[PDB]
Amino acid sequence: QKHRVAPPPHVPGHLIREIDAYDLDGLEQGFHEAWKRVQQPDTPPLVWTPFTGGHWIATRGTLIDEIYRSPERFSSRVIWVPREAGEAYDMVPTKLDPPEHTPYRKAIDKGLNLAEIRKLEDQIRTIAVEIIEGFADRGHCEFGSEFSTVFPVRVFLALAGLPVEDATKLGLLANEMTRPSGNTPEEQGRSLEAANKGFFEYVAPIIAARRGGSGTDLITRILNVEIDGKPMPDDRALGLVSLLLLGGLDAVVNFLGFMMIYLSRHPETVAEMRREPLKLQRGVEELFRRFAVVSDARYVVSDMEFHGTMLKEGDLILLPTALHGLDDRHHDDPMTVDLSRRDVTHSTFAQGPHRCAGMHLARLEVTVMLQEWLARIPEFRLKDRAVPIYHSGIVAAVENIPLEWEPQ
Ligand code: HEM
Numbered sequence: 164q165k166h167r168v169a170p171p172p173h174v175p176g177h178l179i180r181e182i183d184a185y186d187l188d189g190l191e192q193g194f195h196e197a198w199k200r201v202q203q204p205d206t207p208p209l210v211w212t213p214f215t216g217g218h219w220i221a222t223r224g225t226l227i228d229e230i231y232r233s234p235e236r237f238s239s240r241v242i243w244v245p246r247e248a249g250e251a252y253d254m255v256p257t258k259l260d261p262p263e264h265t266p267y268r269k270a271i272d273k274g275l276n277l278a279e280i281r282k283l284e285d286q287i288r289t290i291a292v293e294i295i296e297g298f299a300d301r302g303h304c305e306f307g308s309e310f311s312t313v314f315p316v317r318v319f320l321a322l323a324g325l326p327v328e329d330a331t332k333l334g335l336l337a338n339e340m341t342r343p344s345g346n347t348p349e350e351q352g353r354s355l356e357a358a359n360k361g362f363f364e365y366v367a368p369i370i371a372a373r374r375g376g377s378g379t380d381l382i383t384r385i386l387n388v389e390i391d392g393k394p395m396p397d398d399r400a401l402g403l404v405s406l407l408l409l410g411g412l413d414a415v416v417n418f419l420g421f422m423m424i425y426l427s428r429h430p431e432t433v434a435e436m437r438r439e440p441l442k443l444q445r446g447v448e449e450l451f452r453r454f455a456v457v458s459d460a461r462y463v464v465s466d467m468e469f470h471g472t473m474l475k476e477g478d479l480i481l482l483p484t485a486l487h488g489l490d491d492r493h494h495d496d497p498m499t500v501d502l503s504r505r506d507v508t509h510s511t512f513a514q515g516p517h518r519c520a521g522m523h524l525a526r527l528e529v530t531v532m533l534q535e536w537l538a539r540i541p542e543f544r545l546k547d548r549a550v551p552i553y554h555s556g557i558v559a560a561v562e563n564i565p566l567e568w569e570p571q
């Protein structure tokens with residue numbers, strides 16, 4: 164049964180569209196394909212859905228980009244739908260606007276900046292190689308369970324100085340954050356609340372132990388950056404360390420799944436990467452344009468008119484980032500990966516002050532993955548008649564990716 168909310172007085176009937184972000188129409192054909200169904204040639208730039216507590220959806224890249232760049236008009240005080248889940252959300256600094264946001268982003272950047280991430284290249288490669296060598300000679304693997312859910316998790320837990328045996332419990336918490344269970348806005352609120360508490364419980368003893376610590380891990384490094392000339396307060400620390408874990412463990416895992424399904428269906432594109440290693444390296448951003456996974460929200464700060472649409476203070480707008488990278492008004496033939504594409508502009512990492520702090524790490528993980536994969540498994544395909552299983556939500560997910568190849 165679908166839960167509907169009635170539209171508020173300011174929402175006109177002509178803008179109403181029945182779109183369920185947690186179970187998109189057509190999702191069985193793919194997450195990206197399902198979102199693209201919403202973006203028809205004449206659909207309005209902002210449409211309102213009665214599902215998920217009732218909210219707006221931005222349907223074009225220019226709006227998505229503009230909203231992310233405009234925190235004074237579109238606040239991060241709520242960035243999840245439904246509203247109940249967004250109000251329960253307690254991660255730092257994603258819940259903050261400038262200027263409160265900036266010293267915390269500065270702290271994170273101390274650990275995740277490009278120069279710091281470059282130092283990680285060989286550790287990441289060693290991890291990728293070890294995993295790939297486990298199955299490269301076999302001629303088949305289920306890519307999700309055997310690689311994409313393994314590689315980025317081992318990378319991040321190592322970087323954070325945490326036991327790999329914690330992967331399962333952290334993954335379960337991530338699932339309920341980004342794809343909370345429930346068929347009602349209040350049920351999803353409760354699911355997110357419990358997940359966020361689980362993260363806080365996990366992170367608290369680590370914080371207590373690493374304050375003033377001498378560890379070289381990511382958490383110690385960021386935790387001990389001063390905020391306004393003082394140690395970071397406890398409440399902020401819980402949200403900050405929890406966000407590092409959530410950011411590091413869900414998005415890349417799912418991104419790799421979507422990317423690999425495409426590559427398994429496009430051997431010409433794989434072959435180009437093999438023949439021209441610089442095309443691979445320079446082409447990674449095109450993969451980020453094509454395989455967006457995040458759809459999150461902003462809070463309308465004041466009554467306003469925006470792109471010809473009347474908005475009220477407190478309205479939530481969902482930003483499905485796939486609708487920037489795949490917007491046909493921004494990119495010709497947007498569903499094809501063209502490694503030589505000159506304009507790859509996208510909001511896969513969002514825009515503005517919150518633009519992904521882990522983007523350098525994400526790019527490096529993907530680059531290293533493709534390099535070590537193609538070195539050992541140069542050609543591959545999706546198993547005949549295989550059907551991947553898709554999930555939509557704040558972060559998209561995919562599973563069941565059986566790959567086959569002739570061992571080289
Ligand atoms: C495919 C990979 C990734 C994608 C698509 C992605 C996407 C995003 C997006 C859209 C945001 C903006 C959220 C918002 O404010 O609405 C964000 C923020 C953030 N991401 Fe990533 N992310 C990825 C990987 C990572 C990784 C590996 C980390 C490592 C810790 C990370 C850490 C963060 C952090 C800390 C923020 C908050 C930055 C701030 O609020 O100033 N992300 N990410």
Ligand SMILES: CC1(C)[C@@H]2CC[C@@]1(C)C(=O)C2
Nearest residue numbers: 257341409410414457459
């Ligand atoms: C939307 C995100 C990808 C970004 C980092 C992790 C995530 C789930 C957040 O809560 C903010």
